[PDB]
Amino acid sequence: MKVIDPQHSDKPNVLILGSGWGAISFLKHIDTKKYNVSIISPRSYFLFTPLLPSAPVGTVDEKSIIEPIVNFALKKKGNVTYYEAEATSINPDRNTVTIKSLSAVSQLYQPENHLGLHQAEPAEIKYDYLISAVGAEPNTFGIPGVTDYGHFLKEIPNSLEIRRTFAANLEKANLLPKGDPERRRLLSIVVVGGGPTGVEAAGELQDYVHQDLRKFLPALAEEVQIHLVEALPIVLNMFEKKLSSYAQSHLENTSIKVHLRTAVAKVEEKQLLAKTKHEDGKITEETIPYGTLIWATGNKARPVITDLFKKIPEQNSSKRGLAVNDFLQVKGSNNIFAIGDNAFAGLPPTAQVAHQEAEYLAKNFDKMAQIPNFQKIDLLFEENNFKPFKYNDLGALAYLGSERAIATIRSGKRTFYTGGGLMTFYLWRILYLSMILSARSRLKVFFDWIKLAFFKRDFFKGL
Amino acid sequence: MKVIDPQHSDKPNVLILGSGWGAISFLKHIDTKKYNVSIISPRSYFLFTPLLPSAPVGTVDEKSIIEPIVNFALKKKGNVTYYEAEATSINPDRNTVTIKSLSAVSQLYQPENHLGLHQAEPAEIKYDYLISAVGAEPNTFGIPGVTDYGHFLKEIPNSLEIRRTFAANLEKANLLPKGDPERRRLLSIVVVGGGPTGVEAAGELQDYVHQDLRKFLPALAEEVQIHLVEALPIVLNMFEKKLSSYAQSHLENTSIKVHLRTAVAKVEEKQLLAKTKHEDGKITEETIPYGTLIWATGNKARPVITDLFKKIPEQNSSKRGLAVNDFLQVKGSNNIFAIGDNAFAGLPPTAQVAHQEAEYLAKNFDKMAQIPNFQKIDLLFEENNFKPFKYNDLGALAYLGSERAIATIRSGKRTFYTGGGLMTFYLWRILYLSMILSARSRLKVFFDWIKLAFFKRDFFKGL
Ligand SMILES: Cc1cc2nc3c(=O)[nH]c(=O)nc-3n(C[C@H](O)[C@H](O)[C@H](O)COP(=O)(O)OP(=O)(O)OC[C@H]3O[C@@H](n4cnc5c(N)ncnc54)[C@H](O)[C@@H]3O)c2cc1C
Ligand SMILES: Cc1cc2nc3c(=O)[nH]c(=O)nc-3n(C[C@H](O)[C@H](O)[C@H](O)COP(=O)(O)OP(=O)(O)OC[C@H]3O[C@@H](n4cnc5c(N)ncnc54)[C@H](O)[C@@H]3O)c2cc1C
């Protein structure tokens, strides 16, 4: 029951799923004069994901790296509607999306109708065009105990989960004798995954222990050991070998224990079982005690996207995401497009890709608005002469803790970077500041870093 | 069982109850070379209470107005111990204090012993001298339903309670038709008490509705009605009539409904029953619908202090607090002192009084340290010639919303203030900044106000 469907104004109804890099980047550029835009997301704010590993330890505050959706939609003059809910089903034949857990509906620049909805009432939202940018969810690879005892580093609530857990562990630990193995275990941290997220989590967590906890509890800070576990033989494989080696070397210098070629077989309450392949080809088993476990590895398709694979013939054999065109149209559909991590275009699952794909698609949409026929669609694209999406790889950045970073800025073939250590850290900061999507978030993080210089981090367990 | 008692170092063991204005002001001045100090508080941070009414709505962040105890104790070179727990009983004859809900123990500048305590283990802490600064708790006057449906504005968690409640109400409201009385009720707020806390809560809440909520949901913001209920015939009675009148007039200008001479008889889930005495002497009953109820009125003695009234003969008939001397010694005890809201010295329950009392007492303590006899105590004070505590009333400040405040700065007989509106607001800011107890908190609030100028408030319901 319940079908929300506005059809008086002579503009196509465009429906966006998500409020992340794809959805919000698309929202910033879509022509709200030519189109009526509706967003569906259970998260009422944009998350600047590259600074999330700084949240738990309080190098940056949570509020500093998030921006409410409404602020973005307010800069758009035309009509925008936001449904604070999550899409549970996409319905191609009906051209509707079923929602669930409706918390609120905000209708900006719309002094008009009342939809007649109640909180947590199921509803279908009609669309003329659909943009899917729901993202991916963390992948445990079916390794037992990951979700039971481990914390992902995916969203803002995960930042609070980790702080509470580690804070509780530090308190419990400090009441025990120095020899006690339980004290050593509770002070131990394990981060799984050697990508930017894992490495930066480990580095920020190490920055806290050395720079803050050491000042008032040096006996504890000394006993804290951070571990970083990676299945491949190299950390940060998207960088050059020279930079990976420096990244690894540097982490080791700050007393982070790097387990390369090590895969977690199972996670228990107080330890994880890890297998390690050695140079010669032999496999050995380890046990790594831990008090806090951070899981920052693979991506998996969401149920909403998985369910949609079955409803479209040519998506039936998809796995990692929606198989998409060079025009970012979902294969088999006439009016659904997919950008970011939820779409498979043979590109990396990065914000950089989601951003470009969004800009590309938004520019295609105002081009559609001028052509009479868009007032079957696959053929119109190639017939009306406009370009396939071409990803330009701008490179990669990464913070390694202790005021050192690695960077590679490029464009096309030409590489032109400065990727040492302390200088790259200052670059890493300025560059991250410049690609924040709002002035508020930009000023907030800026103030966070200035405060850090003088007073070094807030670590409140209940806040 | 379990008695913590350090007795090798030749210094008196001074035990402080609380981590508020009294306890921390006393901690800042106590001579840690002449004394060993231990603090017991369930709150591990100092709260700058005058800015608490700015927390819920996000004019200031919660973290900006709190400062960890350890930071204060770190500036003291001598030994300081903090028990994260609450005192459940004071034992005069044993000279110990029973504690409960022990979360942690931190021993600063003490590379020494292990106390052998577990979390939530009952324990008695021995003392040579005791300083009680536990404060008062909010008084409902036994009016039914206050605690069931109302929110106090006393501590940091109360700030989050109010934001969550109002946020939920705004969401529920916006899904209803404009005529609907439920929409009008959910958008209605009632603040009980016309003191600085109540008035400032109302004003800050009104600043949010006009300045922020109006920008993206003007239909909602228009329907929001804030009520301020006061039992006396005047708002802010500590000020001159001229300033109260301007305070009242101004609140009314910003569309706050001021119910003077109105007392709440009972609080129900969706409304409160209020009685109003009129000019001629007649009493009428009202019903005030509400969605959010903030209760900012009287103070009551804590159970810990109430229980102690029975254990000391001369405290048997006490009610509002511990009956104290001119030397701030608890009458009937030889080694217990009381400062702030938990002690009754015939002075107002204010931070200003707690601060002065603390400084006075701390200065008495290093004076005791030089006199051999303190290596029965009532008589030593008057015999050794030092002064009774004399409260100097520096006056009163208050924010009224919409960038207006009222102030009265004085000292002794001489009054010399500037208490108009917009100018007084700038004074009100600078003065509040100057009496914040730490540089960090000072810089944080400073940055909060700068950000407010450009981007106007964060109102995240889950953060
Ligand atoms: C800690 C961390 C650090 C990172 N650092 C970098 C970096 O430095 N550089 C880089 O290029 N990439 C980085 N990434 C990757 C980047 O975050 C993703 O590639 C990017 O967010 C993908 O954009 P998206 O819009 O596809 O998904 P997201 O940006 O994650 O947005 C997905 C949105 O969908 C919403 N949603 C979820 N389920 C539903 C539903 N059922 N209905 C409606 N909405 C839903 C979510 O609330 C969210 O708003 C990082 C990721 C993490 C976790
Ligand atoms: C919202 C608000 C705004 C205010 N604004 C002003 C203002 O502008 N000007 C002004 O002069 N006054 C103001 N006050 C009043 C002022 O804050 C109090 O009078 C002052 O805090 C009294 O200090 P205290 O040390 O007596 O207790 P508090 O400052 O209340 O501190 C009490 C401490 O004791 C701890 N505690 C409680 N129970 C126990 C226990 N059983 N064992 C151990 N510890 C315990 C608490 O955790 C806390 O750390 C305001 C109060 C509030 C609530």
Swiss-Prot record, chains A, B:
Superkingdom per UniProt: Eukaryota
Cofactor needs: FAD
Molecular function in Gene Ontology: identical protein binding; NADH dehydrogenase (ubiquinone) activity; NADH:ubiquinone reductase (non-electrogenic) activity; oxidoreductase activity
Primary localisation category: mitochondrion
SUPFAM superfamilies referenced in this protein's UniProt entry, alphabetically: FAD/NAD(P)-binding domain
Binding site for FAD: 13-43
Catalytic reactions of this protein: a quinone + NADH + H(+) = a quinol + NAD(+); a ubiquinone + NADH + H(+) = a ubiquinol + NAD(+)
Pfam families tied to this protein: NDH2_C, Pyr_redox_2
EC number per UniProt: 1.6.5.9
Binding site for NAD(+): 187-223
Gene3D superfamilies, alphabetized: 3.50.50.100
Cofactor annotation comment: Binds 1 FAD per subunit.
Keywords: FAD, Flavoprotein, Membrane, Mitochondrion, Mitochondrion inner membrane, NAD, Oxidoreductase, Transit peptide, Ubiquinone
Family: Belongs to the NADH dehydrogenase family.
Described function: Catalyzes the oxidation of NADH generated inside the Mitochondrion.
Further comment: Present with 5240 molecules/cell in log phase SD medium.
Protein name (database record): Rotenone-insensitive NADH-ubiquinone oxidoreductase, mitochondrial
Upper classification of the organism: Eukaryota, Fungi, Dikarya, Ascomycota, Saccharomycotina
Gene giving rise to this polypeptide: NDI1
